[PDB]
Design a protein around this ligand. Sequence first.
Ligand SMILES: *P(=O)(O)OCC(C)(C)[C@@H](O)C(=O)NCCC(=O)NCCNC(=O)c1ccc[nH]1
Length: 90
Amino acid sequence: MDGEEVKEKIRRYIMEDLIGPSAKEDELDDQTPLLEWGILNSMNIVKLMVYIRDEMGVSIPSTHITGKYFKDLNAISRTVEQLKAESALE
Ligand SMILES: *P(=O)(O)OCC(C)(C)[C@@H](O)C(=O)NCCC(=O)NCCNC(=O)c1ccc[nH]1
């Protein structure tokens, strides 16, 4: 539950849903910019919100919905791990 072993699973879900059954595994990477390559555009982007809400118990707010936080997996990494740090009351 370290975040990192979860973040790689996000990529698996990205290809299966966010791309679909025509998942171009070749181009799949963490440093591959999803927003920039039109992999994520609104209709599918809500899946990132609800996924992480179900997974790491944290949903990215509508104020943090921006292409600069959603650029790639590592962009989402910095956003999702910071939010778990800000949500950490412990
Ligand atoms: P869909 O996932 O519903 O995106 C809705 C969107 C964020 C475009 C809408 O609520 C909105 O606020 N539109 C006005 C422009 C805006 O706020 N842009 C911010 C950057 N946009 C995005 O990061 C983004 C994500 C998804 C679509 N645009």
